[PDB]
Motif scaffolding. Structure first.
Motif, PDB file in Angstrom:
ATOM      1  N   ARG A  14      11.417 -29.171 112.463  1.00 10.60           N
ATOM      2  CA  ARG A  14      11.604 -29.844 111.180  1.00 10.60           C
ATOM      3  C   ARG A  14      10.299 -30.391 110.614  1.00 10.60           C
ATOM      4  NH1 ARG A  14      17.536 -32.438 111.722  1.00 10.60           N
ATOM      5  NH2 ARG A  14      17.651 -31.065 109.897  1.00 10.60           N
ATOM      6  N   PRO A  24      27.546 -29.890 100.116  1.00 16.42           N
ATOM      7  CA  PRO A  24      26.430 -29.118 100.694  1.00 16.42           C
ATOM      8  C   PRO A  24      26.871 -27.783 101.290  1.00 16.42           C
ATOM      9  CG  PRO A  24      26.378 -31.413 101.451  1.00 16.42           C
ATOM     10  CD  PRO A  24      27.588 -31.285 100.584  1.00 16.42           C
ATOM     11  N   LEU A  25      25.944 -27.057 101.927  1.00  8.80           N
ATOM     12  CA  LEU A  25      26.176 -25.654 102.279  1.00  8.80           C
ATOM     13  C   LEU A  25      27.138 -25.508 103.462  1.00  8.80           C
ATOM     14  CD1 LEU A  25      25.500 -22.657 101.732  1.00  8.80           C
ATOM     15  CD2 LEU A  25      23.160 -23.085 102.484  1.00  8.80           C
ATOM     16  N   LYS A  78      19.389 -15.573 103.513  1.00  2.00           N
ATOM     17  CA  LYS A  78      18.143 -16.335 103.539  1.00  2.00           C
ATOM     18  C   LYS A  78      18.342 -17.794 103.166  1.00  2.00           C
ATOM     19  CE  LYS A  78      15.010 -12.491 102.514  1.00  2.00           C
ATOM     20  NZ  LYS A  78      14.059 -11.953 101.501  1.00  2.00           N
ATOM     21  N   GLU A  79      19.452 -18.129 102.513  1.00  2.00           N
ATOM     22  CA  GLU A  79      19.748 -19.530 102.255  1.00  2.00           C
ATOM     23  C   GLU A  79      20.173 -20.250 103.529  1.00  2.00           C
ATOM     24  OE1 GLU A  79      18.579 -20.703  99.573  1.00  2.00           O
ATOM     25  OE2 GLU A  79      18.226 -18.602  99.047  1.00  2.00           O
ATOM     26  N   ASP A 120      17.943 -24.395 113.239  1.00  2.00           N
ATOM     27  CA  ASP A 120      17.853 -25.730 113.822  1.00  2.00           C
ATOM     28  C   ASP A 120      18.849 -25.902 114.959  1.00  2.00           C
ATOM     29  OD1 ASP A 120      16.878 -28.824 112.318  1.00  2.00           O
ATOM     30  OD2 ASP A 120      17.598 -28.514 114.339  1.00  2.00           O
ATOM     31  N   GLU A 125       8.390 -18.623 106.464  1.00  2.00           N
ATOM     32  CA  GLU A 125       8.881 -17.386 107.058  1.00  2.00           C
ATOM     33  C   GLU A 125      10.231 -16.990 106.478  1.00  2.00           C
ATOM     34  OE1 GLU A 125       6.866 -20.191 110.019  1.00  2.00           O
ATOM     35  OE2 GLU A 125       8.144 -20.214 108.241  1.00  2.00           O
ATOM     36  N   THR A 126      11.029 -17.970 106.055  1.00  4.61           N
ATOM     37  CA  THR A 126      12.277 -17.656 105.373  1.00  4.61           C
ATOM     38  C   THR A 126      12.015 -17.171 103.952  1.00  4.61           C
ATOM     39  OG1 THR A 126      13.690 -19.098 106.704  1.00  4.61           O
ATOM     40  CG2 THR A 126      14.370 -18.676 104.442  1.00  4.61           C
ATOM     41  N   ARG A 135      13.890 -13.342 113.688  1.00  9.04           N
ATOM     42  CA  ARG A 135      13.307 -14.658 113.901  1.00  9.04           C
ATOM     43  C   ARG A 135      13.486 -15.139 115.333  1.00  9.04           C
ATOM     44  NH1 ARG A 135      12.639 -18.266 108.808  1.00  9.04           N
ATOM     45  NH2 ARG A 135      11.316 -19.019 110.517  1.00  9.04           N
ATOM     46  N   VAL A 169      19.562 -18.898 106.889  1.00 10.42           N
ATOM     47  CA  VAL A 169      18.805 -18.636 108.110  1.00 10.42           C
ATOM     48  C   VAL A 169      18.215 -19.933 108.644  1.00 10.42           C
ATOM     49  CG1 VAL A 169      17.068 -17.204 109.185  1.00 10.42           C
ATOM     50  CG2 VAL A 169      18.275 -16.364 107.208  1.00 10.42           C
ATOM     51  N   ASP A 170      17.704 -20.772 107.743  1.00  8.94           N
ATOM     52  CA  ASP A 170      17.005 -21.989 108.135  1.00  8.94           C
ATOM     53  C   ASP A 170      17.922 -22.962 108.863  1.00  8.94           C
ATOM     54  OD1 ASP A 170      18.520 -22.134 105.927  1.00  8.94           O
ATOM     55  OD2 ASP A 170      16.999 -22.993 104.600  1.00  8.94           O
ATOM     56  N   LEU A 171      19.157 -23.120 108.378  1.00  2.00           N
ATOM     57  CA  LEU A 171      20.043 -24.149 108.917  1.00  2.00           C
ATOM     58  C   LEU A 171      20.448 -23.844 110.352  1.00  2.00           C
ATOM     59  CD1 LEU A 171      21.268 -26.770 108.437  1.00  2.00           C
ATOM     60  CD2 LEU A 171      23.282 -25.697 107.379  1.00  2.00           C
ATOM     61  N   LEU A 223      15.344 -28.311 105.144  1.00  2.37           N
ATOM     62  CA  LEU A 223      14.667 -27.343 106.010  1.00  2.37           C
ATOM     63  C   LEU A 223      14.503 -26.027 105.262  1.00  2.37           C
ATOM     64  CD1 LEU A 223      17.402 -28.599 107.769  1.00  2.37           C
ATOM     65  CD2 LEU A 223      15.916 -27.853 109.580  1.00  2.37           C
ATOM     66  N   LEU A 224      13.304 -25.801 104.735  1.00  2.00           N
ATOM     67  CA  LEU A 224      12.946 -24.543 104.096  1.00  2.00           C
ATOM     68  C   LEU A 224      11.608 -24.106 104.666  1.00  2.00           C
ATOM     69  CD1 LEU A 224      14.147 -24.954 100.426  1.00  2.00           C
ATOM     70  CD2 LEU A 224      14.425 -22.882 101.797  1.00  2.00           C
ATOM     71  N   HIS A 225      11.538 -22.870 105.145  1.00  2.00           N
ATOM     72  CA  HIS A 225      10.365 -22.380 105.852  1.00  2.00           C
ATOM     73  C   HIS A 225       9.734 -21.206 105.122  1.00  2.00           C
ATOM     74  CE1 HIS A 225      10.105 -25.094 109.019  1.00  2.00           C
ATOM     75  NE2 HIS A 225      10.732 -24.450 109.986  1.00  2.00           N
ATOM     76  N   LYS A 277      20.947 -30.458 103.385  1.00  2.00           N
ATOM     77  CA  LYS A 277      20.246 -30.120 104.623  1.00  2.00           C
ATOM     78  C   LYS A 277      19.428 -28.845 104.487  1.00  2.00           C
ATOM     79  CE  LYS A 277      23.200 -31.370 108.045  1.00  2.00           C
ATOM     80  NZ  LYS A 277      24.012 -30.835 109.167  1.00  2.00           N
ATOM     81  N   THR A 278      20.020 -27.805 103.908  1.00  2.00           N
ATOM     82  CA  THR A 278      19.320 -26.535 103.788  1.00  2.00           C
ATOM     83  C   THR A 278      18.117 -26.645 102.870  1.00  2.00           C
ATOM     84  OG1 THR A 278      21.042 -25.983 102.195  1.00  2.00           O
ATOM     85  CG2 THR A 278      21.200 -25.128 104.443  1.00  2.00           C
TER      86      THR A 278
END
Ligand code: GTP
Ligand code: GDP
Ligand code: MG
Lengths: 432, 430, 36, 46, 43, 54
Positions: C10, F6-7, A105-106, A113, C33-34, A149, A108-110, C29-31, C25-26
């Motif tokens: 975004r 970062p990640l 879940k950390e 995009d 739904e996430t 998703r 999924v967002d990246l 972008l935080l949603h 970056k992560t």
């Protein structure tokens, strides 16, 4: 224009793309830098830049750096977008639960995009190719959530599935049945086609046919690259009967609960063995029906074909294809369901399969791929149900998954979903 | 990235880990001064898992040397890789325990705990995403078996999710070197059974055996023993540092080996332990590797898995091989010997490969196995503790420190709980 | 609520620019739904 | 420019297509013997 | 209404036992095809 | 090097590290490098832009 974006997940997904993307680069003339030394046959995978240079439509994901970290260093470090390849800090560690609820879940967002940014670059998207593995956590957990998703984000687009099914006898994991039974819900209501392929069968084929007594994963990834190449060969280059992704979905799926074909590729022979054997259209299409050459450890002779998709490639002619189809129909060993009198969808392409230096297959002027939806696959899940059942009874390894934060009732429900699906396939085997 | 802090306790802990930091310095091409002199680029790619960067292009191991006595630390500094450790990590006091678990755990270590926590938390903060810690100690002493567990119990409360490994040394039945050995052993294993993710049971009398049997060494000193243990510790995290065709980490090995939280005791082994008579007559090939892997003589514990049922088996491979033989030979041992593997877990073996072999060697592997034969150790300690605890023998030393008598009851009742629960899993119907 | 575009993807993240500081970056972008 | 280049490419491609296709021997049965020989030698070297 | 204010009985079925695969007995037969006791490690 | 990063990020060593030896005979040869290794290829850093007045 037809375009496809690949969403390789996990170590199995990452390594397969090394075989696939090197194959596509060598097919079209891409140098490892990405630049032509020399019409737009490459638009189905690549995209043009401001420098006059081609960039693939791929997104490599993993929850641990070192698998993908090497790709940033090797010969193709200058071919793929440095942000296209997303890694993580900690991995699921053979655990669907951690990769579905905690670590994934950390990230999924990246990735969602770069899926979108690669999507807007395309004008008309044809489909998404998804590579993952049922055994490991990331290729099962994070792979599962990204379809959930992707389903509600792209409701009309076609999501194809190439996956490694856990093998009946050998494996690299002990906890591998728990992921396999529970991943099946996502590939049931959130996929359009599925191509579960097993490593033992490729192990069997490589030793018997390719003379390689001692293979490794690269010898396995290369054949997987040939199958996906055959499917998209209609799109990239012209054909007598070009078959798009929408066409072969239509003539393979009788019911939405039934989207599990089986893959087959022929010929696969070494040059010394290819030296003393002519390869005709009839010869290869007879090898496409041999159970020793099926890529899943199940015998179609124990079941009946409901739908069979054809894909020829190379120097082939429709006159011989119709000759080979007729002979196959006149074979009582091959069975067909009652309500499918005609079960063939034939695709013809011009360009012969290209060969890779350092590879194994011989350069052959013709080939054939096979996508037969049969009911003999339902024995494969029945083996998984028994091993899962004799593990789940004494409640082993449950403390790992529940303590993560998933409810134990989902275990029993997941076992039921495969149980219901198995009954549906057997009902099709019943004939009126 | 993925970092590990190597803890250390007692004479056994310091002497074992003194060799351990050398063998990983050689693997990473680091001189005794501390600078990088290796040639391959992968020799420094994942070095941050253990080493910490210093100015001037130097590296400091992320170790915390703890012992109640300043004695062995002089010998540690006087070793070949003596000054590679930064001096501020050396934590020590005035008066040791004298093989007394009570003094280490309650009256003397409780002064030394706060300082060690300061160094440990300093190292813990420096790394971004630390995987876990790693402690080496003996269960037959006063400090590593004593305050060495109090470090375990405190740190678990502070960091619950991180993995804690323990390459403990358990006492041996046939020859012992401490007379209050079962008193400390039966009361330290209670600390392990509550606060530990994994423990590897290393027994010296097995280690003395292997040197003569598989290597034929006339005079195997404790250095050769300590190098033998340290080859195992490298072999579990080689896949963590070096890339592989099929990789694994400590946590990946963690999930697949414990079926229930009470069971985290294993028996390791090292594959290419080849004798100086047998190198002439040998063929380095993977069936020969797994042949010597599963031979019970190659275990480094005092238990025979042929007497019990293998719950889960780990095989972490080093070197570039062909995996078909890796999968086939594992399957052959799986089926030819059916009765030694439990029936309700199909495919009781987990495999992992690491592309880079150990330095100077072509092919290798290490084995981690969770067996029900380990319960033969616990009952033996229980009886040897009980027979010593019937007559209140050697007890005035411990209760004079202020401990009541009742912890011995619960430490042996928890211990005998484990043997009964272990036994029911052995005799279980599919 | 279908984004249909990268900009609108975004444009629905939960990251107030004024308050949120020095993120990667992560974290940008935080949603919802996430976070479900 | 590329629009007409595509036409000429289809032209010489269809001419070589008819040359390879119309020979029934090579169409039903065809191998590049030098390429098979080359990869045999490469395999032997490896 | 006066009759919908009356509490109403609720009975729900617990469904039925799940489907068992036709090859399950064959699998149980095949579980001992090659497994042997103490053939390599020994007694 | 000592940063938190970062990640999705390349590590500072592997931002510029060279791969292992592609030749199978030399030590520290990876499976990837032996599968796809080409010593005699230096990638050109192709880049071009511009063209406004045209
Ligand atoms: N056919 C094939 N399978 C592979 C390959 N690499 C990994 N696998 C399969 O992947 C499964 C385990 O998952 P991995 O791909 O190794 O790693 P993962 O998918 O990211 O899952 P985690 O290890 O938990 O992170 C094993 O059961 C293998 O069968 C490959 O190159 N070819
Ligand atoms: N394997 C191994 N064991 C050791 C070594 N040195 C001591 N031991 C073991 O440690 C035990 C005594 O440890 P001790 O010095 O009392 O530990 P401490 O009380 O924590 O300082 C003995 O049973 C030895 O078997 C060594 O170099 N290698
Ligand atoms: Mg993985």
């Amino acid at each position: 224009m037809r375009e496809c974006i690949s969403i390789h997940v996990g170590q199995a997904g990452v390594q397969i793309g090394n075989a696939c993307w090197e194959l596509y680069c060598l097919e079209h003339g891409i140098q490892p830098d990405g630049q032509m030394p020399s019409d737009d046959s490459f638009n189905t995978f690549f995209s043009e830049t401001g420098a006059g240079k081609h960039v693939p439509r791929a997104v490599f994901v993993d929850l641990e750096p070192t698998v993908v970290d090497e790709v940033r260093t090797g010969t193709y470090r200058q071919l793929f977008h440095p942000e296209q390849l997303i890694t993580g800090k900690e991995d699921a560690a053979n655990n669907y639960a951690r990769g579905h609820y905690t670590i994934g879940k950390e990230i999924v967002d990246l990735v969602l995009d770069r899926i979108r940014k690669l999507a807007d670059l395309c004008t008309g998207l044809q489909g998404f190719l998804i590579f993952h593995s049922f055994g490991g956590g990331t290729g099962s957990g994070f792979a599962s959530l990204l379809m959930e998703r992707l389903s509600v984000d792209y409701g009309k687009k076609s999501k194809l599935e190439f996956a490694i099914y856990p093998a009946p006898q050998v494996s690299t994991a002990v906890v591998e049945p728990y992921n396999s039974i529970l991943t099946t819900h996502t590939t049931l209501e959130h996929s359009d086609c599925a191509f579960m392929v097993d490593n033992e069968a490729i192990y069997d084929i490589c030793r018997r046919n390719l003379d390689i007594e001692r293979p490794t994963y690269t010898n396995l990834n290369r054949l997987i690259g040939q199958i996906v190449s055959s499917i998209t060969a209609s799109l990239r280059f012209d054909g007598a009967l070009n078959v798009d992704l929408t066409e072969f979905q239509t003539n393979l799926v009788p019911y939405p609960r039934i989207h599990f074909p089986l893959a087959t590729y022929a010929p696969v022979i070494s040059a010394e063995k290819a030296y003393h054997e002519q390869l005709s259209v009839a010869e290869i299409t007879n090898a496409c029906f041999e159970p020793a050459n099926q890529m899943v450890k199940c015998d179609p002779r124990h079941g009946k074909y409901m739908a069979c998709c054809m894909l020829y490639r190379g120097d082939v002619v429709p006159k011989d294809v119709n000759a080979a189809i007729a002979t196959i129909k006149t074979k009582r060993t091959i069975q067909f369901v009652d309500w499918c009198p005609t079960g063939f969808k034939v695709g013809i392409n011009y360009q012969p399969p290209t060969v890779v230096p350092g590879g194994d297959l011989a350069k052959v002027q013709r080939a054939v791929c096979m996508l037969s939806n049969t009911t003999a696959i339902a024995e494969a899940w029945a083996r998984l149900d028994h091993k899962f059942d004799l593990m789940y009874a004494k409640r082993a390894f449950v403390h790992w998954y529940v303590g993560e934060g998933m409810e134990e009732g989902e275990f029993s429900e997941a076992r039921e979903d495969l149980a219901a699906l198995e009954k549906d396939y057997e009902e099709v085997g019943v004939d009126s | 990235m993925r970092e590990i802090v190597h803890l250390q306790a007692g004479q056994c802990g310091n002497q074992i880990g003194a060799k351990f930091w050398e063998v990983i310095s050689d693997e990473h091409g680091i001189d005794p001064t501390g600078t990088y002199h290796g040639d391959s680029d992968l020799q420094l790619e994942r070095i941050n898992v253990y080493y910490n960067e210093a100015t001037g292009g130097k590296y400091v191991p992320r170790a915390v040397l703890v012992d109640l006595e300043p004695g062995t630390m002089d010998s540690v500094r006087s070793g070949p890789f003596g000054q590679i450790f930064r001096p501020d990590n050396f934590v020590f006091g005035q008066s040791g325990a004298g093989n007394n678990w009570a003094k280490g755990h309650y009256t003397e270590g409780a002064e030394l705990v706060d300082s060690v926590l300061d160094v440990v938390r300093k190292e813990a903060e420096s790394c971004d995403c630390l995987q876990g810690f790693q402690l080496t100690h003996s269960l037959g002493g006063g400090t590593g078996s004593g305050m060495g567990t109090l470090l375990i119990s405190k740190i678990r409360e502070e960091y619950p999710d991180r993995i804690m490994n323990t390459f403990s040394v358990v006492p041996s039945p046939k020859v012992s070197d401490t007379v209050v050995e079962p008193y400390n052993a039966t009361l330290s294993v209670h600390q392990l059974v509550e606060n530990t993710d994994e423990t590897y049971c290393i027994d010296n009398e097995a280690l003395y055996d292997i040197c003569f049997r598989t290597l034929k060494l006339t005079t195997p000193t404790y250095g050769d023993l300590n190098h033998l243990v340290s080859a195992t510790m490298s072999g579990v995290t080689t896949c963590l540092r070096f890339p592989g065709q099929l990789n694994a980490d400590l946590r990946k090995l963690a999930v697949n080996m414990v079926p229930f939280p009470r069971l985290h005791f294993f028996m390791p082994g090292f594959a290419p332990l080849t004798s100086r008579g047998s190198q002439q007559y040998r063929a380095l090939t993977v069936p020969e590797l797994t042949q010597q892997m599963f031979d019970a003589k190659n275990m480094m514990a005092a238990c025979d898995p042929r007497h019990g049922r293998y719950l889960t088996v780990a095989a972490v491979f080093r070197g570039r091989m062909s995996m078909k033989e890796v999968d086939e030979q594992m399957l052959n041992v799986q089926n030819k010997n059916s009765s030694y593997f439990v029936e309700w877990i199909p495919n009781n073996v987990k495999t992992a490969v690491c592309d880079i072999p150990p330095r100077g060697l072509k092919m290798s592997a290490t084995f981690i196995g969770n067996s029900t034969a380990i319960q033969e150790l616990f009952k033996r300690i229980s009886e040897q503790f009980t027979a010593m605890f019937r007559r209140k023998a050697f007890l005035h030393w411990y209760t004079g420190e202020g401990m009541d008598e009742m912890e011995f009851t619960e430490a042996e009742s928890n211990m005998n709980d484990l043997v009964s629960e272990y036994q029911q899993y052995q005799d279980a119907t599919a | 609520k279908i984004p249909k575009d990268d900009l609108d993807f975004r444009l629905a993240t939960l990251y107030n620019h004024h308050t949120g500081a020095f993120k990667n970056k992560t974290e940008i972008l935080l949603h919802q739904e996430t976070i479900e | 420019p590329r629009e007409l280049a595509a036409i000429e490419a289809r032209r010489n491609r269809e001419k070589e297509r008819q040359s390879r296709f119309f020979n029934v021997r090579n169409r039903v049965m065809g191998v590049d013997v030098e390429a098979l020989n080359y990869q045999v030698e490469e395999r032997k070297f490896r | 209404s006066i009759y919908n204010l009356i509490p109403s009985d609720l009975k729900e079925p617990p469904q039925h036992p799940r489907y068992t695969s036709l090859f399950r007995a064959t699998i149980k037969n095949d579980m001992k095809k090659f497994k042997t006791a103490m053939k390599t490690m020994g007694p | 090097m000592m940063g938190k990063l970062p990640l999705g990020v390349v590590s500072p060593y592997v931002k510029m590290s060279s791969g292992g030896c592609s030749d199978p005979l030399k030590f520290y040869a990876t499976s990837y490098c032996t599968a796809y290794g080409r010593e005699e290829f230096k990638p050109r850093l192709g880049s071009h832009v511009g063209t406004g007045y045209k």
